[PDB]
């Protein structure tokens, strides 16, 4: 596999270059219209995520079915960590799109969304107080893609070790002590447990919106949702 022969700097450059673009939403808010804007946004982001996944080193080396499984398990996690990343410099708000920035009061427009909203805000505030770097973020997002669907595999684990090497290589590059390196490595990966929790809460919420038949869901978004039931 070509990914294992990459250096740490080559790994950072490969992940930064594959970053998907930031998309816009359609140019006050009900529950049905706010849900439509977000599912429309998520549907267009999924097309770019799949092409981002192809460019994560080591992901092409898996079979087609293994790629489908890793994306099916992790797509909402990847959307969520992308949302909390670009919401960092907006404390107390969620930057879904540059023309779609929401606060907690907007979360109460749709039921059952208050809890997930506050969880996303908390994760974003956590990243802000940790001064998460873009090089660290792209490593964390790739880890989610390869890890979340790994049980549910030896090559994936070798690539996961390679990304851990890259995370440590970035922290020692920023001057952190040996002790600060593994402490920061632990803090970052413990966030991934909560991103998983938020994704599972968000998946149940999307299912109820499918069952309430309130908003039109795309066939692709429905197939990703269907893979979790």
């Amino acid at each position: 596999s070509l990914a294992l022969s990459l250096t740490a700097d080559q790994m950072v450059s490969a992940l930064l270059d594959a970053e998907p673009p930031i998309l816009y939403s359609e140019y006050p808010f009900s529950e049905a219209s706010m849900m439509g804007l977000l599912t429309n946004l998520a549907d267009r982001e999924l097309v770019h995520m799949i092409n981002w996944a192809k460019r994560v080193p080591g992901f092409v080396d898996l079979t087609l079915h293994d790629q489908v499984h890793l994306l099916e398990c992790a797509w909402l996690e990847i959307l969520m960590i992308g949302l909390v990343w670009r919401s960092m410099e907006h404390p107390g708000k969620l930057l879904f799109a540059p023309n779609l920035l929401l606060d907690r009061n907007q979360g109460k427009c749709v039921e059952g969304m208050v809890e997930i909203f506050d969880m996303l805000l908390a994760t974003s505030s956590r990243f802000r107080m940790m001064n998460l770097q873009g090089e660290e973020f792209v490593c964390l997002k790739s880890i989610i893609l390869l890890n979340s669907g790994v049980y549910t595999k030896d090559h994936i684990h070798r690539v996961l070790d390679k990304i851990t090497d890259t995370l440590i290589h970035l922290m020692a590059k920023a001057g952190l002590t040996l002790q600060q390196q593994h402490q920061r490595l632990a803090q970052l990966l413990l966030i991934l447990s909560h991103i998983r929790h938020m994704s599972n809460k968000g998946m149940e919420h999307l299912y109820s919106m499918k069952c309430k038949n309130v908003v039109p869901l795309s066939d692709l978004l429905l197939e990703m949702l269907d893979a979790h039931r």
């Binding site: 799949i50 996944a53 087609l64 692709l220």
Partner: peptide, 10 residues
């Protein structure tokens, strides 16, 4: 049948 199959091959 899986749209995700198509997008991963395009």
């Amino acid at each position: 049948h899986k749209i995700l199959h198509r997008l991963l091959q395009d």
